Amino acid sequence: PTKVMVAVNASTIKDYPNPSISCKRAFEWTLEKIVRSNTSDFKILLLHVQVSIYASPEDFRDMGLHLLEFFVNKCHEIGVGCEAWIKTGDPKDVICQEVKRVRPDFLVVGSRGLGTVSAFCVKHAECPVMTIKRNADETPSDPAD
Amino acid sequence: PTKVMVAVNASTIKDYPNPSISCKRAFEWTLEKIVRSNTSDFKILLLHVQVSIYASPEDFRDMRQSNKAKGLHLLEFFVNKCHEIGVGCEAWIKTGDPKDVICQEVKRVRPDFLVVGSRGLGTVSAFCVKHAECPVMTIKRNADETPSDPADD
Ligand SMILES: Nc1ncnc2c1ncn2[C@@H]1O[C@H](COP(=O)(O)O)[C@@H](O)[C@H]1O
Ligand SMILES: Nc1ncnc2c1ncn2[C@@H]1O[C@H](COP(=O)(O)O)[C@@H](O)[C@H]1O
Numbered sequence: 364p365t366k367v368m369v370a371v372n373a374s375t376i377k378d379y380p381n382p383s384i385s386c387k388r389a390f391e392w393t394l395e396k397i398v399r400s401n402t403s404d405f406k407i408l409l410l411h412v413q414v415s416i417y418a419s420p421e422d423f424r425d426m427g428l429h430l431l432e433f434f435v436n437k438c439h440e441i442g443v444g445c446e447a448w449i450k451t452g453d454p455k456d457v458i459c460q461e462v463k464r465v466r467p468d469f470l471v472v473g474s475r476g477l478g479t480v481s482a483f484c485v486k487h488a489e490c491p492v493m494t495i496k497r498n499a500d501e502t503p504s505d506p507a508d
Numbered sequence: 509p510t511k512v513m514v515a516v517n518a519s520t521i522k523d524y525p526n527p528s529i530s531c532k533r534a535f536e537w538t539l540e541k542i543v544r545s546n547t548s549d550f551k552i553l554l555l556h557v558q559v560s561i562y563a564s565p566e567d568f569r570d571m572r573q574s575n576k577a578k579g580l581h582l583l584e585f586f587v588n589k590c591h592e593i594g595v596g597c598e599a600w601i602k603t604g605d606p607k608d609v610i611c612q613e614v615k616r617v618r619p620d621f622l623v624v625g626s627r628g629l630g631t632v633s634a635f636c637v638k639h640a641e642c643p644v645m646t647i648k649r650n651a652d653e654t655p656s657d658p659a660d661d
Contacts, residue, residue: 404544469541491537495643
């Protein structure tokens with residue numbers, strides 16, 4: 364079973380807990396075009412890298428995981444096996460550290476196509492890397508978003 | 509069926525008409541890890557980018573070693589590889605600057621993704637990842653087939 368690591372992160376423009384447009388597209392494309400209906404031939408490894416006094420009812424209302432849950436649901440829905448977890452530190456380094464630890468067959472990263480993370484992975488990950496850029500119609504006017 | 513474009517080129521260290529170590533690794537890896545036994549779920553699109561008076565027998569040997577011929581022999585190697593395991597394929601040659609042409613071909617043919625080998629030098633693979641208008645899979649060579657000078661392919 365081909366182990367596909369998918370680096371997933373939060374959106375900075377879409378409200379929380381939405382995944383970034385880039386990693387969502389990358390994830391969905393991978394399921395559409397790579398996994399297809401062959402759901403037992405692949406295993407998705409979802410990695411997200413992450414960087415008390417109460418005085419009124421209001422303070423209780425005010426009071427990474429929900430991201431992972433979005434993708435785990437997507438996998439469950441079409442029946443692909445997955446494992447999802449969080450590690451801490453600099454995302455591009457940690458992704459690479461996790462590639463050498465987990466040894467997935469390849470790494471999927473979205474990319475905003477700005478020329479940080481996706482470029483470093485391609486350069487340094489110790490497995491093949493699939494870089495997926497956003498569709499034109501879902502690319503924000505400012506590509507950095 | 510997922511259209512997989514695979515950019516293939518000739519080796520400069522291996523005698524002709526051998527594929528480069530990197531694109532060979534790239535192709536074989538894709539068959540092994542992506543296509544697997546599901547040979548009808550994928551279609552391989554093999555692209556090679558290529559960069560008359562005869563006076564002596566030697567001129568005919570040269571012709572047979574031209575880029576055109578280096579090109580076709582290259583395509584035939586991969587088409588045989590596809591046919592052997594029963595994966596549908598299409599293979600052709602375009603002319604010009606390889607990185608530019610690969611990208612032009614991506615937008616013309618519209619494959620679901622592009623597979624390129626990579627020597628891991630930090631020319632072609634990095635340009636594709638940056639510019640191709642489809643997903644790009646970059647596959648580097650195994651340690652044990654990487655020549656002492658990584659520029660060699
Ligand atoms: N904090 C993170 N944790 C896991 N993956 C990340 C993280 N940040 C970025 N990525 C990956 O990098 C992609 C964006 O790459 P880039 O545009 O080069 O920053 C996202 O689609 C993710 O695949
Ligand atoms: N003439 C060419 N035609 C098609 N693909 C090429 C050509 N030259 C290089 N490539 C692709 O670029 C890869 C090498 O990438 P790089 O080491 O980054 O130059 C090869 O493995 C091929 O996948």
